[PDB]
Amino acid sequence: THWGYTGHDSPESWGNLSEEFRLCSTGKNQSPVNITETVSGKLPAIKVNYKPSMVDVENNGHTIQVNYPEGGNTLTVNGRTYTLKQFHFHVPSENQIKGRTFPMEAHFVHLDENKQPLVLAVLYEAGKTNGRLSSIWNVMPMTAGKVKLNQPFDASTLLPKRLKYYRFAGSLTTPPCTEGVSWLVLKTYDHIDQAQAEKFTRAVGSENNRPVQPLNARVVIE
C-alpha cells in the first residue's frame, strides 16, 4: 500500500489506507511525541559499542536509510544487548522538546535477543555543516536505488559523549505504526545546516515528519 506525507495518502489517512495500518489511527501509544512534562528518575546508562562496518545506503522513497547486514554494532542498557539494524532521518524532526521542532532527527533502530524494538533518537540543531554525515550525504541516492558500500561507516561518530536521555514507550512513526517500541531520545543535540537538510528533502521528495501524537497514559522519564 502506498503511503506518504501529502495528498490522499497523508498521515491523517494512513489508518484508512489498509486494515494492516489500522493502529496508525486507533493506537493510544503512538510516536512521535512532544516531550513537555516529565518525571525525573534514575535511568540505566547507555553503553554504546558501535564500530567501522560495511553498510548499504538506501533511498526507499520515504527516507534515506543506512542498513547493517551484519551485527556487531550494539548498545547495552539495563544489561540487555540491542543490535543496530539501521538508522535513518526525518527532516524536519518528528519528536519535539517543549514544542520545539528541530531541522532534523536521526532514528537508530535496534532489536534485542527477544525481538524487542528500541529506537535511539538524535536531534540536530541549526549550525555548521555536519562533517561526520558527509560520507552518507555524498553517496546518498536520489531515486529508489541502493549504494552497496566499499564505503564503511562508523556510527559511533554520530552519537554524543554525554548519553543522557528521555525514555518513553511508543510506536514506529511510519506505517504500520507498530507499538511496543522503546524510545530513548538523547538530551544532547548535534548540528546540521540548511544545505544538508534541503539535500535530504530533494532526495526523498518531501518533508517526512509525522505530526506529534498525544501521550495519553504514558509518562516520559528524564
8 Å CB contact between 97 and 123 = yes
How far apart are alpha carbons 45 and 76 in whole angstroms? 8
Determine which one of 2, 62, 110, 191 is catalytic: 62
Range in contact with Zn ion (rule: CB under 5 A) among 13-21, 102-110, 153-161, 205-213: 102-110
Q: Cβ closer to Zn ion: 45 or 144?
A: 144
Give the residues after which the backbone of the chain is interrupted, taking a C-to-next-N distance over 2.5 angstroms as a break: none
- The residue (of 39 and 182) whose beta carbon lies closer to Zn ion is 182
Strand partners for 119: 109, 183
- The correct pick among 107, 110, 167, 210 for binding Zn ion (CB under 5 A) is 107
Residue nearest to Zn ion (CB): 107
Cell output for 135 = 560520507
The answer to whether 62 is a known catalytic residue is yes
C-alpha pair distances (Å), 13 with each of 29, 33, 178, 199? 18, 18, 16, 27
Nearer residue to Zn ion within complex by CB, 107 or 110: 107
| Cell 535496534, residue located | 110
The answer to whether the CB of 66 falls within 8 A of the CB of 57 is yes
In angstroms, the CA 188 to CA 83 distance is: 22
State the binding string over 50-89 for Zn ion (x if CB under 5 A, else -): ----------------------------------------
Binding-site size for Zn ion (CB under 5 A) equals 2
**Could you tell me the smallest distance in angstroms from the CB atom of residue 63 to Zn ion?**
7
Residues making contact with Zn ion (CB under 5 A): 107, 173
**Active-site amino acid positions:** 62
